[PDB]
Protein backbone atom coordinates (compact mmCIF):
# COMPACT_ATOMS: atom_id res chain seq x y z
CA UNK A 1 0.00 0.00 0.00
CA UNK A 2 0.93 3.68 -0.15
CA UNK A 3 2.23 3.35 3.40
CA UNK A 4 1.70 -0.06 4.97
CA UNK A 5 4.86 0.45 7.00
CA UNK A 6 3.09 3.15 8.98
CA UNK A 7 0.10 1.01 9.96
CA UNK A 8 2.18 -2.03 10.91
CA UNK A 9 4.21 0.26 13.17
CA UNK A 10 1.48 2.64 14.30
CA UNK A 11 -1.81 0.75 13.97
CA UNK A 12 0.08 -2.31 15.19
CA UNK A 13 2.32 -0.77 17.85
CA UNK A 14 1.03 2.74 18.56
CA UNK A 15 -2.38 1.07 18.80
CA UNK A 16 -1.25 -0.58 22.03
CA UNK A 17 -2.38 2.27 24.28
CA UNK A 18 -5.24 0.56 26.12
CA UNK A 19 -3.09 -1.83 28.20
CA UNK A 20 -0.59 1.00 28.61
CA UNK A 21 -2.65 2.14 31.60
CA UNK A 22 -2.43 -1.11 33.57
CA UNK A 23 0.98 -1.96 32.13
CA UNK A 24 2.47 1.21 33.59
CA UNK A 25 -0.02 1.73 36.40
CA UNK A 26 2.95 1.26 38.74
CA UNK A 27 4.22 4.70 37.72
CA UNK A 28 2.98 7.72 39.67
Number of H helices, E strands in the chain: 2, 0
Which whole-number Å values give the CA distances from 4 to 7, 9, 11, 24, in the listed order? 5, 9, 10, 29
> CA–CA separation, 17 vs 11, rounded Å?
10
Classified as helix, coil or strand, 11 is helix
Amino acid sequence: DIGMGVTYLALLAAFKVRPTFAAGLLLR
